[PDB]
Design brief:
The structure is cut from a larger assembly and holds three copies of chain A. By secondary structure, chain A is of the alpha+beta class. Chain A contains six helices and ten strands; from the N terminus they run βαβββββββββααααα. Chain A starts with 9 loop residues before the first strand and ends with a helix. β10 of chain A pairs antiparallel with β2 of chain B, so a sheet runs across the interface. The structure holds a molecule of 2 linked components (NAG-NAG) (2 copies) and 2-acetamido-2-deoxy-beta-D-glucopyranose (NAG) (7 copies). Chain A: Belongs to the betacoronaviruses spike protein family.
């Protein structure tokens, strides 16, 4: 990240590392810069030739992938620098297997995990004539003879916009009757107050749902205010 | 009792819940608080929905940016082409511009169709997960959370859904010597459910997913065949509950 | 210079191809990297009389792959070796028509995968070793050791057959399993038409790249398909008119190739999701779904 540092490694793809000092700005190249190509930080990978990252034998998890089992990161391995390493698949383990020994757990734990799944996307519509020509009667007359292309793109976008509401209805509207909870909130000692709806908010959403709606930096996707803010000069 | 039947669905008897109910409730509340802290701190968990919004905005901005391209014409300004060129040359440049803009708009429509197909596949997967984990219990491995699935809670999200999968995970283990069956009087006793365990001194029978030793009797074992056939069968006495009540 | 007036077409094609290239590595990671630790077998190989030597890794090979994995790798003829050439063998020009170098000279390249075959074999070895030594437990938490006879008895008790059926027929069941593995070897060493689902994955990309190379010989209504010839034989005023047709035709061919690659990537992603579901529900546990994993009781 540019907030972290400004040190840069350059990968030349499909090029042997002997050919990279030949491809230096003594003869003219497409990029002007060549100052990386002078130096001892040259490594050869099956992806190509990496310049500016020192190879480190210590295998970590893959931070910035490169190819053929090579990753790179920005670490304090020297005082900060870009390092290149083979990726590590995980901790090595060996099960103590025997034909008369079993291991049976004496305790448990309860883990609540989170899974995020997209359901619908933005419903859009395109004005074909105003996009193609725009306030032009002669261009509209020339566009009219080209065909029914605008009609079939309108048909495709209308089908997509119907399909989004079909997806939302199919995912969420699976319950016949809108059930409601009793006012007593003693569900056997379990605390459900962080996922049950909060009536204090104008929209009856829970704390976690409010956190999700705050964390997703959504665009407008509606809430047009009926053309007034667009018509007003800004 | 609902959570007891959830435990009984995954092969753990309900006495475990009825003796560890306060601990399990405390663990559930701690996990809910950990989810609250994780969602308050880290914002990278919602990358799928954020990428949906970014893809729609990027496609619309690209379609807006395609209007300034000339597509080989003398100008991208239609009124300037009108005011400068004659009719036939102007129609040539308008033909080039309409061809370029129509090709860009068809590319946008095709990309939206492919992205809508991907979103529909994800929505069908989400509907299946909701119907089989919120409205019931799942025996499918790793379909709803790593571990043994107990419950699930749906949460709404911008352009998507969020599932909170509750799972049972075994934690603390212990080595035990095991045998497949037991010789009692030449008979081969096999457990009904559970594992024949020992440490070296006495032989007990447990359940698979929790440690709870019980005396090996004829109530929880069944006799099948004799001792000559099973490989690895050890000898041990099997308790008879009827004999002390008969002798009483 | 004339291509700069056509807009963000190249950038959006490059963005789509980069998205596909990231998605392929995501598919491979999702299918294979499902276990957090690299388990391995004990040095003794007595798993209750069952013979696992054909699927366990062979240390004699330079890359730790099993006999069946070597048979599958020999059965698939991998013709799309892009960056193995490293452009030196292409720079040395031979009179033989080499298809990879000819498409490499046209701007068409093949990036290497992130995970190599050694790492994929290590993932499969860890999964198979964990499955043999622990059963379904390593898919739910820590791996718990259990004898293989007790594990087979518990798999039979899953499908409604009591444990004494195994414990009185264990030698016969082991003999049947070894004979089935031998018949798998004899089928794979002869019938090479079974791996058409991957041979078509190779061929659909090779044929598409060959077609995209063959599109350059089309004139698209121009006087020639050689832009140096057009520039040398015409003025710039009508040369731009002659060259706009070639530019538009080659750009439409590139967009067609990118669209077909997007549809094929969608199909491949669906198949990878099915493979990941099959791995998680049949390797990491026992499945009660009928005909999901083999005909019969899984
Ligand atoms: C099983 O694990 C749980 C959770 O780790 C144990 O509960 C802890 O017990 C210790 C006893 O000193 C307490 O200090 C912790 O605060 C408890 N944790 C929680 C979440 O309450 C439990 O003791 C373990 N063993 C048994 C007996 O089930
Ligand atoms: C398990 O199977 C393997 C392979 O069938 C046996 O190992 C030998 O493998 C070679 C091929 O590499 C065969 O030509 C030999 O006939 C196999 N047997 C022997 C005795 O060399 C292995 O013996 C089998 N082990 C058990 C316990 O059945
Ligand atoms: C690069 O070239 C050198 C010398 O020709 C050769 O030894 C080496 O194997 C080549 N490496 C690759 C990856 O092509
Ligand atoms: C990595 O290992 C090789 C051989 O073991 C050695 O020559 C090299 O110096 C090592 N590199 C580092 C950074 O330790
Ligand atoms: C268990 O495995 C060992 C190691 O191969 C073997 O010698 C022994 O016969 C097996 N069976 C028993 C009952 O110990
Ligand atoms: C329409 O305009 C009036 C004018 O002030 C405004 O009060 C009203 O809110 C607008 N309608 C909507 C739906 O915003
Ligand atoms: C069981 O025994 C093995 C070998 O003695 C040991 O490595 C393992 O940690 C033991 N398991 C437990 C839970 O103590
Ligand atoms: C473990 O050994 C002790 C010896 O004092 C015995 O009392 C106990 O029953 C044994 N437990 C098991 C599960 O074998
Ligand atoms: C004790 O168990 C062993 C295990 O097979 C068996 O061989 C032996 O006969 C048993 N002892 C008696 C007295 O039956």
């Amino acid at each position: 990240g540019t907030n972290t540092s400004n040190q840069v490694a350059v990968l030349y793809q499909g090029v042997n590392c002997t050919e990279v000092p030949v491809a230096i700005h003594a003869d003219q190249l497409t990029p002007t810069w060549r100052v990386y190509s002078t130096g001892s930080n040259v490594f050869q990978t099956r992806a190509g030739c990496l310049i500016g990252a020192e190879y480190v034998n210590n295998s970590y998890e893959c931070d910035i992938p490169i190819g053929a089992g090579i990753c790179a990161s920005y670490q304090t391995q020297t005082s900060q620098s870009i390092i290149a390493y083979t990726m590590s698949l995980g901790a090595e383990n060996s099960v103590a297997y025997s034909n008369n020994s079993i291991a049976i757990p004496t305790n448990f734990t309860i883990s609540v995990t989170t899974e995020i799944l997209p359901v619908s996307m933005t419903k859009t519509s395109v004005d074909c004539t105003m996009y193609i020509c725009g306030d032009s009667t002669e261009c509209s007359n020339l566009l009219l003879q080209y065909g029914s292309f605008c009609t079939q793109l309108k048909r495709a976008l209308t089908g997509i916009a119907v399909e989004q509401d079909k997806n939302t209805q199919e995912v969420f509207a699976q319950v016949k009757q809108i059930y409601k909870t009793p006012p007593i909130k003693y569900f056997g000692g379990f605390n459900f107050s962080q996922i049950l709806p909060d009536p204090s908010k104008p929209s009856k959403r829970s704390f976690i749902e409010d956190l999700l709606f705050n964390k997703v930096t959504l665009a407008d996707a509606g809430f047009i205010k009926q053309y007034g803010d667009c018509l007003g000069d800004i | 009792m609902q959570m007891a039947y959830r435990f009984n669905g995954i092969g753990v008897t309900q006495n475990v819940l009825y003796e560890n109910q306060k601990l399990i409730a405390n663990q559930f509340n701690s996990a809910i608080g950990k989810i609250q802290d994780s969602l308050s701190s880290t914002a990278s968990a919602l990358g799928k929905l954020q990428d949906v919004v970014n893809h729609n905005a990027q496609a619309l901005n690209t379609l807006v940016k395609q209007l300034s391209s000339k597509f080989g014409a003398i100008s991208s300004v239609l009124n300037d082409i009108f005011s400068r060129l004659d009719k036939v040359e102007a129609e040539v440049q308008i033909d080039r511009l309409i061809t370029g803009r129509l090709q860009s708009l068809q590319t946008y429509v095709t990309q939206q169709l492919i992205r809508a197909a991907e979103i529909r596949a994800s929505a069908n997967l989400a509907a299946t997960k909701m119907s089989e984990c919120v409205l019931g219990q799942s025996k499918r491995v790793d379909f709803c959370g790593k571990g043994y699935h107990l419950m699930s809670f749906p949460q709404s999200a911008p352009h998507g859904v969020v599932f909170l999968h509750v799972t049972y995970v075994p934690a603390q283990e212990k080595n035990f010597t095991t045998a497949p069956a037991i010789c009692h009087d030449g008979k081969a006793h096999f457990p009904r459910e559970g594992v024949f365990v020992s440490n070296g001194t006495h032989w007990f029978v447990t359940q698979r997913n929790f440690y709870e030793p019980q005396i090996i009797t004829t109530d929880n074992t069944f006799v099948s065949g004799n001792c000559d056939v099973v490989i690895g069968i050890v000898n041990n006495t099997v308790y008879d509950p009827l004999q002390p009540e008969l002798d009483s | 210079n004339l291509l700069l007036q056509y807009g963000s077409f190249c950038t959006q094609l490059k963005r789509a191809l980069t998205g596909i290239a990231v998605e392929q590595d995501k598919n491979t990671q999702e299918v294979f990297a499902q276990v957090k630790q690299i388990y391995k077998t004990p040095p003794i190989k007595y798993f209750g009389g069952f013979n696992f030597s054909q699927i366990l890794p062979d240390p004699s090979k330079p890359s730790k792959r099993s006999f069946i994995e070597d048979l599958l790798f020999n059965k698939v003829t991998l013709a799309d070796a892009g960056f193995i050439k490293q452009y030196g063998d292409c720079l040395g020009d031979i009179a033989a028509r080499d298809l990879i170098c000819a498409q490499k000279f046209k701007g068409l390249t093949v990036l290497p995968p992130l995970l190599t075959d050694e790492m994929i074999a290590q993932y499969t070895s860890a999964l198979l070793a964990g499955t043999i030594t622990s059963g379904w437990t390593f898919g739910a938490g820590a791996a718990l050791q259990i004898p293989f006879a007790m594990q087979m008895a518990y798999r039979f008790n899953g499908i409604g057959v009591t444990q004494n059926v195994l414990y009185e027929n264990q030698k016969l069941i082991a003999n049947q399993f070894n004979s089935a593995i031998g018949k798998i070897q004899d089928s794979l060493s002869s019938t090479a038409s079974a791996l058409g689902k991957l041979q078509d994955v190779v061929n659909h990309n090779a044929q598409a790249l060959n077609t995209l190379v063959k599109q350059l010989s089309s004139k698209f209504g121009a006087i020639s398909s050689v832009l140096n010839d057009i520039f040398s034989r015409l003025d710039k005023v009508e040369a731009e008119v002659q060259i706009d047709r070639l530019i538009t035709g080659r750009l439409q061919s590139l967009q067609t190739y990118v669209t077909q690659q997007l549809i094929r990537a969608a199909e491949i992603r669906a198949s990878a999701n099915l493979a990941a579901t099959k791995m998680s529900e049949c390797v990491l546990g026992q499945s009660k779904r009928v005909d999901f994993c083999g005909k019969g009781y899984h």
